[PDB]
Amino acid sequence: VVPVFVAILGIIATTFVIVTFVRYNDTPIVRASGRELSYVLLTGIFLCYSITFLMIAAPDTIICSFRRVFLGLGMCFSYAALLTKTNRIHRIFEQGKKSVTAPKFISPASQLVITFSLISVQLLGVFVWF
Amino acid sequence: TRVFKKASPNGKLTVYLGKRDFVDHIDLVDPVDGVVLVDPEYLKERRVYVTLTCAFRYGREDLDVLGLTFRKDLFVANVQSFPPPLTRLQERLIKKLGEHAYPFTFEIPPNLPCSVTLQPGPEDTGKACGVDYEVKAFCAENLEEKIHKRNSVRLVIEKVQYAPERPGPQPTAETTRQFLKPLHLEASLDKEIYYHGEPISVNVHVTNNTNKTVKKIKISVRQYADICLFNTAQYKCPVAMEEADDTVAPSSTFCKVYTLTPFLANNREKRGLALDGKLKHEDTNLASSTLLRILGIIVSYKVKVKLVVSRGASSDVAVELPFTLMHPKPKEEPPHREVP
Structure with a gap:
């Protein structure tokens, strides 16, 4: 019972923290907080709490398959999003490398490309041995 | 014996200053002296106000995608000029000009920022980023309500x-x-x-x-x-x-x-x-x-x-x-x- 209650409380908290961001979506914090990366990270957290139900259930072919494929993904989404956000913060932190003009800035579009590549590596790695 | 003057678009109000650079010694700064020449017939019951304002503006390439700019006024001072210690220049200007000349003087607090402009880009159009100072003299019935473009003179001054x-x-x-x-x-x-x-x-x-x-x-x-x-x-x-x-x-x-x-x-x-x-x-x-x-x-x-x-x-x-x-x-x- 207790893991299920913990997961329900966590999913309620995640719902609140995502509805707030969807509701405002204009304040400077949300804008400068990497909206796409934040949404990907929150989706990963959302998927993280569902896996307790697949673990607590009775073993089965489809259930074991879901466990295997989703366990790595739940961590991979969150940590890839955090890695991309940290890379953006680091690139802003120092400035002016040994080159003219503005320091390189990761664009909102490129963040999705890097995050999805890092996720897809784990996806294919899981699928091969699945 | 060489001062700078600027007139309003109508030409009724004129502002005279002696310098454009005001040196900072860390302790105390050169006061901003000036003279304003007005037209009593043009203004029925209005007053002539002068103001000094320090402005800071900042934006960056990554924040432009998100649509964010930052602005603040670090120091703002207001004086009433037309209805009134005179420095030598103000007395000499009032002597050279007529009876409708009235002085103003500003004291910039120390430990305030200097004047700095960040290099603009190829496609930057309007005001640059950085921190600057300006004086603005206008005519209005009251200070808090409205500032017309015709009755206003603006000059940029550098603190250095x-x-x-x-x-x-x-x-x-x-x-x-x-x-x-x-x-x-x-x-x-x-x-x-x-x-x-x-x-x-x-x-x-x-x-x-x-x-x-x-x-x-x-x-x-x-x-x-x-x-x-x-x-x-x-x-x-x-x-x-x-x-x-x-x-x-x-x-x-x-x-x-x-x-x-x-x-x-x-x-x-x-x-x-x-x-x-x-x-x-x-x-x-x-x-x-x-x-x-x-x-x-x-x-x-x-x-x-x-x-x-x-x-x-x-x-x-x-x-x-x-x-x-x-x-x-x-x-x-x-x-x-x-x-x-």
């Missing part, structure tokens, strides 16, 4: 600092790096305070007791800018560089002198590089160092010496030396234009 008269200590640095017998690096400059356009000479002395070999020596001059009003990262950028292929063999010493000079000709593509205050879109040199003894951009300058020793993947051994880059106090006020 100049090089200290007493030189400081010689800048020197030393480092020791022992790997998994040490490598010992020493660097020094000739003087602490440099003037714009003057060369910087750095003397390096490396002793290598290790079995390693230094391949390259990289020397650079770098600028740091602190935007410290909102929660904003510091801007850092190299403004001069020199890479030398000098090898320091194991069990050997080495000593050399290098000369560098930062200037704007090769640094014109660096968007966001700090520059001295501008009245207009004219050219100004690199920004001068700030003497603190805040609230806006703070400029600093350093020299960096790096050794690239790899053997074996390459490791770096580096030192830094701060310095000051300023203008000497001139006998004549700067023109704020291209003279020839």
